[PDB]
Amino acid sequence: SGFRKMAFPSGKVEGCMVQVTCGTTTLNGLWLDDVVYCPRHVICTSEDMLNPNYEDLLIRKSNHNFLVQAGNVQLRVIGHSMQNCVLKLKVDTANPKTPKYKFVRIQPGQTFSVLACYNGSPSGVYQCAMRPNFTIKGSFLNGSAGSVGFNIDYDCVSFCYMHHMELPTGVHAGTDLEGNFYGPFVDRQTAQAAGTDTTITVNVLAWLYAAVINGDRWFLNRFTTTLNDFNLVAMKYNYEPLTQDHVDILGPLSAQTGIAVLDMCASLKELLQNGMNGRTILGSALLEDEFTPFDVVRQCATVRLQ
Amino acid sequence: SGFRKMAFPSGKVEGCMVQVTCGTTTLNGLWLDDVVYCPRHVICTSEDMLNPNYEDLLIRKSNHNFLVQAGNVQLRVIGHSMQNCVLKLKVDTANPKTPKYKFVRIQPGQTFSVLACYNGSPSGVYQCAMRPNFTIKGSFLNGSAGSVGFNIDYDCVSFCYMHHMELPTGVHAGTDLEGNFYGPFVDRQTAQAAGTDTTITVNVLAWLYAAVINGDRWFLNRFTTTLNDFNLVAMKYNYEPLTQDHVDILGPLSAQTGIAVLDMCASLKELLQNGMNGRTILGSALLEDEFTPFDVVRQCATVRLQ
Ligand code: NA
Ligand code: NA
């Protein structure tokens, strides 16, 4: 059947993307109902990014200072609002292509689809994960601010991310659709420490469960370990600690196979201590931490009634 | 910054995805103008799949024997014709969401975006490359036939692939939108095998250039080798030879980096001889053959006006 990291079909999100222009700075905005959400720094000037006083800058701006465009049609702005680090532009027209949407804040280790846009036009879509240090290993160039991260559940598009900035390490940071930054970051061009980026342990365990189902099982031991002992070893090897919520997520895969979560944890604990030493798991010498138990269950090959 | 295997936005393709049902078997269909394209084995029963007489089966089929549904709306089939391995169903309505499009036959080593659909409804989008043996290492389940692969240039959607079946090895095969299969395969449940799967070397060279872009160069040498010598060494391993066209495609990468293409070839040549099996930490991270030079160029910052 094959395993592939998949983004959700972006057609619903592409219908809410508009161009927001302020001065000579143009970047993307999210048009839902009669509100357009965009990053704050559209109002910023070149010299005023080290420590912008956004509230003072916003007052000097007016409604006609913002140009919102959706294709050949231009949208008229009736008001501007600052919700944390996100600018809310009320327009005179509701988006007819507005889908059933809800705003969600995701936890580290979860995945979502990113629609990278430039000048208001969608350019590409990719799947990524929220790193434990609240960064994302995305692919963004200058002008990609305003791109949104999302997940589609049935018919409801659950928006969870908006891109703002790129850190010096090369990773990217942003806010939820309510303007609150993921992690201890601010939208200022000043030195900011992201913190150590640990490996998503729950996704690695799901990867190991996928390997066991597909036949890769050289790395298994009959031993079981306590959660405390595994968490101690995991942090010594820069693995994110395993919580009760992570174990609950791993429940379906552990039941589909015969391996208890702490049984698999003992296998991974000895894996970390000894290394892979020439052996490969699922065809790679490295482990995957951005493939979720959701992804494994939906894409795994099943038995065949003959 | 940041490199990610990105797929083209699937909105334009999403608007052409319909559900084609013949008897009890249901597949996906591509609705362009007043014609719906779908795999022809939709007319097959549970039997008639080991060795089908597609001409005989389709001659017995009637126009009302096909049920085409787009959302809740159901389209009437006014005509049916066979184009090689693909069924062309003329419907009573031209698709109003039809984009500017053309039918393209890709070459091995090139990439495109797959929109996986089930029951005519889009489910996920991922990027993949045509393997040297004309197979696809995709993620497909039963009922995914009719899913299409595409590339987007401006507003023109270049359809290049429609998924049909899965080989016992787990890889997938399909046809162009003209019904002609990619590879020596046929749409029959018979014993078929793909050719030797080799590494698309021009893509790994592009991957190495991206690693240089990210600031990692501790696996390069200052040596240069001729193309003929590299190809002999490369062909001894399971690597495809470099054509002059491949070098020309790699030219922009060399210009942006200052590393000669043959310089990078010698670096790869030395790595292979020293035992880069693709089974070590440095081999499994540097050996990626599904990231084209265009992807590296399209995700890089060019000359920067300061
Ligand atoms: Na164990
Ligand atoms: Na070299």
Numbering used by the authors:
A (entry chain B), B (entry chain A): 1 to 306
Quoted passage from the original study:
The main protease of SARS-CoV-2 (Mpro, also referred to as 3-chymotrypsin-like protease or 3CLpro) is responsible for the majority of nsp processing, cleaving at 11 conserved sites along the polyprotein including self-excision of Mpro by autolytic cleavage of its own N-terminal and C-terminal autoprocessing sites. SARS-CoV-2 Mpro is a functional homodimer of two symmetrically disposed protomers that are each 306 residues in length (33.8 kDa). The active site of Mpro features a Cys145-His41 catalytic dyad, which orchestrates nucleophilic attack at the carbonyl carbon of the invariant P1 glutamine and the formation of an acyl enzyme intermediate central to efficient peptide cleavage. Using C-terminally substituted Mpro chimeras, we have determined X-ray crystallographic structures of Mpro in complex with 10 of its 11 viral cleavage sites, bound at full occupancy intermolecularly in trans, within the active site of either the native enzyme and/or a catalytic mutant (C145A).
